[PDB]
């Protein structure tokens, strides 16, 4: 078992102070606001998760899935209420997340020791060729 | 006569009654004359046999009332016809006080007109007029039924309040603090009973045969066969095929008023000769215009934007307090699922930290406000807040409308 | 794309792709081809048209259709000349003062009555008589100096919004019916249409 | 522990009338104390996490 927190409609985001050192380009922090269903909230977050967002390349009117445990953002998609802006759109619009934006939850999974052995023997991580 | 007479003057219908009673006396505030010239008083409009072609005139306009002649005559009618309105009986009302409810955005000149017409002709002794808003805080004085619905989940008068009225004329949202309402964060929505009836006319004209001369049918249909989208516009559209109502034209030869039927129920299997209008989409699309005025291609912001901006004008310390206790007032709010829908919408808009709750009085809010005003007459703070005849005489009519009940004073 | 394609080096705009059956072979912009507040997205003419449609929805009878210029002038202080020139719209009329109803109301309360005289003859009484025979229009209220200009300021701009005109997204569904899927704009009229029957009903009169 | 000391002293001082949500809805001072205690509870939970 493992307990995790998560945050889930994106309202707005602002990236970023003076270098005052060896920082050629400085992005101190990024402010992001989420809407959800049971109320909205804004927060501040690291530049690294901002670069992760840029890798995801999400828009401003979107719904995302950010897990603060691993600092990874997943683009759930567009917002359903933001439909009919254009007559066509390939991406599935997807409804808005239900409940509180800041979700505390716990998960329970059953595995076997052979699964751990296989995972360690043949790791799937890696970005190089 | 210790107990005053409470008059909630409505643009559509007025509620006159003694402070003793628990229910108001309902009398129409209008004038409809048949095309042949035989006019009929406001209370006698309901007894007429034809409603197809009438000429209408309502003394109360969008803002307020200007010509006091019809209102004075109607006030005398509800004040000098003990036979038509049983129980009530009065000679002069000399020692009788007056408790009235008039809007906070009244014209100072028109407020002076109202004060002079109520005092210097009928010979009152004590008056008190204030908007229906301030009296609702007095709901903590007397026990009553008050359904509080939580937005998030699936002295005696209360200083903290923020109340919305939605009657026939228009809609008004007021913040009340310390028992003294704020007169700047107040926001007016033009969608009232008139505008909903007009939208009903236009949308039936988009669907079924026209009735634009026949507006009483429009009002009856609006009061009867509508229901607010419980969840969303699209999902309520998914119920248009399965759910539908059918209204029948009122045949003046047979029945002065029509009826609405549901095909599921077989309790009314009687066939009828007249034509039947099917309403399958306009039941729920019509109430949606408050949240989506652009359906009728208007530049009007909307209810949620209005309440959000009105909160924005309020000081930050008092902002979270108002949403924690919201009371629903007005005859438009009797539409089913409206309170829950608006609660869900504004709670979704408002951030997570503060949870907003909406209090609904069961049934219509008009009689709820009337019994609240009757309790205010019962409430002894009215004794300390009242005025007398000598105060009116020693000063001019301008002082009474510019100092005590004046709105710029409380700004 | 298919590898190796022939180009003639003329035009060759990688972001401009125009293709048709060539019935006119003309760009819609070749040479300017011609001849968040909602007050910004919709221009002054459009917001004024929305306003006059709003006021024309206010009325409940035929007689107040020519009363629309008077009501709109009372609302926003525009002369009736431009109301009749640029809006491009789609005794019962003169307030309730008919003497016929005045003498007919006697039969309304004739069931029981016990009137008595208690009155004087003063300036207040004269003003009461004037109010009783009121016969006044909102235009007369506003043109005259009986109401302070600060009262006008706090009655007109205490209602309007100025910065946030929309907080929820717009559904933008067809005008005739409510087909929520596969909506599209019309060829000429530029109004959203959904169904075949909707297009047939719209192309005649609305388009 | 630093937050818990303040939380427990606040709960001891006014833990009888400020606990109910009925008084939280109708308040000017007590609702602020309830907000402070819930905020410090959330803060300590986040710190433990
Ligand atoms: N149960 C109901 N369902 C729908 N509409 C209603 C219902 N009851 C009353 N109404 C509408 O509310 C309006 C009454 O407004 P009212 O309280 O008279 O405003 P005012 O006090 O400004 O005259 C009527 O136009 C009526 O159509
Ligand atoms: F006078 Be009301 F109830 F708008
Ligand atoms: Mg009223
Ligand atoms: Zn259509
Ligand atoms: Zn078209």
Curated annotation (Swiss-Prot), chain A:
It comes from the Eukaryota. Probably forms a homohexamer. Interacts with RVB2 and may form heterododecamers with RVB2. Component of the SWR1 chromatin remodeling complex composed of at least ACT1, ARP4, RVB1, RVB2, ARP6, YAF9, VPS71, VPS72, SWC3, SWC4, SWC5, SWC7 and SWR1, and perhaps BDF1. Component of the chromatin-remodeling INO80 complex, at least composed of ARP4, ARP5, ARP8, RVB1, RVB2, TAF14, NHP10, IES1, IES3, IES4, IES6, ACT1, IES2, IES5 and INO80. Component of the R2TP complex composed of at least RVB1, RVB2, TAH1 and PIH1. Interacts with SPT15/TBP and HSP90. Present with 11600 molecules/cell in log phase SD medium. It is found in: Nucleus. It comes from Saccharomyces cerevisiae (strain ATCC 204508 / S288c) (Baker's yeast). This is RuvB-like protein 1. Disulfide bonds: none annotated. Belongs to the RuvB family. The chain holds residues 134 to 265 of 463 of the full protein.
UniProtKB/Swiss-Prot annotation, chain B:
Gene3D superfamilies: 3.30.420.40, Actin, Chain A, domain 4. SUPFAM superfamilies: Actin-like ATPase domain. It comes from the Eukaryota. Keywords: Activator, Chromatin regulator, Cytoplasm, Nucleus, Transcription, Transcription regulation. It is found in: Cytoplasm; Nucleus. Belongs to the actin family. ARP6 subfamily. This is Actin-like protein ARP6. The gene is ARP6.
Curated annotation (Swiss-Prot), chain C:
A zinc finger (HIT-type) spans 174-207. Zn(2+) 2 binds at residues 186, 189, 202, 207. GO terms for cellular component: chromatin; nucleus; Swr1 complex. Transmembrane segments: none annotated. GO terms for molecular function: nucleosome binding; zinc ion binding. The keyword Nucleotide-binding does not apply. GO terms for biological process: chromatin remodeling; protein targeting to vacuole; regulation of DNA-templated transcription. It is found in: Nucleus. The keyword Transmembrane does not apply. Keywords: Chromatin regulator, Metal-binding, Nucleus, Zinc, Zinc-finger. Zn(2+) 1 binds at residues 174, 177, 194, 198. It comes from the Eukaryota. InterPro entries: Vps71/ZNHIT1, Znf_HIT. Belongs to the SWR1 complex at least composed of ACT1, ARP4, RVB1, RVB2, ARP6, YAF9, VPS71, VPS72, SWC3, SWC4, SWC5, SWR1 and HTZ1. Participates in the catalytic exchange of histone H2A for the H2A variant HZT1, an euchromatin-specific factor, leading to chromatin remodeling and changes in transcription of targeted genes. Indirectly involved in vacuolar protein sorting. This is Vacuolar protein sorting-associated protein 71. It comes from Saccharomyces cerevisiae (strain ATCC 204508 / S288c) (Baker's yeast). The gene is VPS71.
UniProtKB/Swiss-Prot annotation, chain D:
It comes from the Eukaryota. It is found in: Nucleus. Transmembrane segments: none annotated. Component of the SWR1 chromatin-remodeling complex composed of at least ACT1, ARP4, RVB1, RVB2, ARP6, YAF9, VPS71, VPS72, SWC3, SWC4, SWC5, SWC7 and SWR1, and perhaps BDF1. Belongs to the SNF2/RAD54 helicase family. SWR1 subfamily. Present with 656 molecules/cell in log phase SD medium. Catalytic component of the SWR1 complex which mediates the ATP-dependent exchange of histone H2A for the H2A variant HZT1 leading to transcriptional regulation of selected genes by chromatin remodeling. This is Helicase SWR1. The gene is SWR1. The chain holds residues 1076 to 1124 of 1514 of the full protein.
């Amino acid at each position: 078992k493992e307990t995790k927190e998560v945050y889930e409609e994106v309202t707005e985001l602002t990236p970023e102070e003076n270098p005052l050192g060896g920082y050629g380009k400085t992005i101190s922090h990024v402010i992001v606001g989420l809407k959800s269903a049971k109320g909205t909230k804004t927060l501040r977050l690291d530049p690294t998760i901002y670069e992760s967002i840029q890798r995801e390349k999400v828009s401003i009117g979107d719904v995302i899935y950010i897990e603060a445990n691993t600092g990874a953002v997943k683009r759930v998609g567009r917002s359903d209420a933001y439909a009919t802006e254009f007559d066509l759109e390939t991406e599935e619009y997807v409804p808005l997340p239900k409940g509180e934006v800041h979700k505390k939850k716990e998960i329970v999974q059953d595995v076997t020791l052979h699964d751990l052995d296989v995972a360690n023997a043949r790791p799937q991580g890696g970005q190089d060729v | 006569e210790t107990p005053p007479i409470v008059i909630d003057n409505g643009s559509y219908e007025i509620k006159f009654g003694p402070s003793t009673n628990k229910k108001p006396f309902r009398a129409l505030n209008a004038l409809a004359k048949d095309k042949f010239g035989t006019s009929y008083l406001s209370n006698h409009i309901k007894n007429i046999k034809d409603i197809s072609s009438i000429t209408f005139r309502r003394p109360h306009e969008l803002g307020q009332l200007t010509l006091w002649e019809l209102e004075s005559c109607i006030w005398d009618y509800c004040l000098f016809n003990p036979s038509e309105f049983d129980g009530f009986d009065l000679k002069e009302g000399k020692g009788h006080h007056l408790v009235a409810s008039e809007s906070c955005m009244t014209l100072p000149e028109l407020s002076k007109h109202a004060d002079q017409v109520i005092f210097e002709e009928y010979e009152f002794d004590s008056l008190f007029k204030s908007p229906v808003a301030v009296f609702v805080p007095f709901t903590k004085s007397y026990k009553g039924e008050m359904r509080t619905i939580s937005g998030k989940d699936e002295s005696d008068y209360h200083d903290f309040q923020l109340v919305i009225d939605s009657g026939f004329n228009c809609t008004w949202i007021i913040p009340v603090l310390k028992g003294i309402p704020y007169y700047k964060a107040v926001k007016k929505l033009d969608i009232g009973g008139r505008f909903l009836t007009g939208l009903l006319k236009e949308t039936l004209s988009f669907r079924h045969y026209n009735m634009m001369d026949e507006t009483i049918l429009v009002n009856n249909i609006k009061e009867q066969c509508l229901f607010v989208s419980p969840v969303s516009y699209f999902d309520s559209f998914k119920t248009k095929d399965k759910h539908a109502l059918e209204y029948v034209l009122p045949d003046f030869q047979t029945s002065f008023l029509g009826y609405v039927r549901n095909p599921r129920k077989e309790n009314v299997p009687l066939p009828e000769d007249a034509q039947i209008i099917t309403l399958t989409d306009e039941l729920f699309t019509i109430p949606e215009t408050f949240f989506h005025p652009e359906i009728s291609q208007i530049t009007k912001p909307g209810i949620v934007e209005a309440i959000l901006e009105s909160l924005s004008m309020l000081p930050e310390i008092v902002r979270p307090l108002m949403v924690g206790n919201i009371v629903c007032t007005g005859g438009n709010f009797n539409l089913p699922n409206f309170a829950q829908r608006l609660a869900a919408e504004l709670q979704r808009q408002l951030p997570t930290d503060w949870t907003c709750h909406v209090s609904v009085p069961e049934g219509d809010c008009a009689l709820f406000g009337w019994e609240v005003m009757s309790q205010f007459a019962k409430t002894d703070s009215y004794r300390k807040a009242r005025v007398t005849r000598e105060e009116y005489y020693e000063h001019g009519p301008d002082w009474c409308t510019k100092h005590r009940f004046g709105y710029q004073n409380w700004i | 794309k298919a590898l190796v394609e022939e180009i003639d080096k003329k035009t060759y705009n990688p972001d401009i792709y125009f293709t048709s059956l060539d019935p006119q072979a003309r760009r819609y912009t070749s040479k300017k081809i011609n001849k968040h507040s909602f007050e910004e997205r919709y221009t002054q003419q459009e917001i004024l048209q929305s306003d006059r449609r709003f006021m024309e929805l206010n009325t409940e009878n035929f007689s107040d259709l020519p009363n629309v210029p008077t009501l709109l002038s009372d609302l926003t202080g525009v002369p009736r000349d431009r109301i009749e020139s640029t809006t491009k719209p789609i005794y019962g009329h003169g307030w309730v003062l008919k003497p016929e109803t005045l003498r007919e109301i006697q039969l309304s309360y004739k069931s029981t009555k016990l009137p008595k005289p208690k009155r004087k003859n003063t300036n207040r009484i004269v003003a009461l008589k004037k109010v009783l025979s009121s016969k006044r229009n909102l235009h007369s209220f506003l043109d005259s100096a009986l109401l302070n200009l600060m009262d006008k300021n706090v009655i007109y701009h205490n209602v309007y919004n100025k910065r946030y005109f929309k907080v929820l997204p717009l559904i933008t569904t067809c005008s005739i019916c409510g087909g929520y899927d596969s909506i599209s704009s019309c060829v000429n009229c530029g109004n959203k249409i959904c169904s075949v029957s909707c297009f047939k009903l719209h192309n005649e009169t609305r388009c | 522990n630093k937050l818990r000391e303040t939380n427990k002293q606040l709960q001891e001082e006014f833990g009888e009338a400020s606990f109910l949500n009925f008084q939280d809805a109708n308040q000017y001072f007590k609702y602020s104390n309830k907000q402070k205690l819930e905020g410090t509870v959330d803060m300590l939970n986040f710190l433990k996490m």
